[PDB]
Amino acid sequence: RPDFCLEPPYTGPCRVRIIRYFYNAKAGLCQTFVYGGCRAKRNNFKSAEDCLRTCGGA
């Protein structure tokens, strides 16, 4: 569980529709969001696998 894993998702004020993944501290699992390609934060994976691969869920 890396520090950044506890970093909220960032959709930015851009005009796009991307399905990124993050580590939800409420569900404890990695969820997706409609990222807009604006200043993508650290907690932004391209897939649920990358998420678990980065923060290690399970």
**Domain regions of the chain by residue span:** 1-58
Q: What are the tokens at 50?
A: 């990358």
Method used experimentally: NMR
User: CA-CA distance, 14 to 54, in Å (whole number)?
Assistant: 25
User: Three-state secondary structure along the chain?
Assistant: CCHHHHCCCCCCCCCCCEEEEEECCCCCCEEEEEECCCCCCCCCECCHHHHHHHHCCC
Q: Give yes or no for a contact between 23 and 55, defined as CB atoms under 8 angstroms apart.
A: yes
User: CA-CA distance, 7 to 41, in Å (whole number)?
Assistant: 8
> Cα dihedral angle (21, 26, 27, 31), rounded to 10 degrees?
-10
Q: Which CATH number fits domain 1-58: 2.40.50.140, 1.10.150.120, 2.10.77.10, 4.10.410.10?
A: 4.10.410.10
Contacts of 4 (CB under 8 A, 6+ apart): 42, 43
User: CA-CA distance, 47 to 31, in Å (whole number)?
Assistant: 9
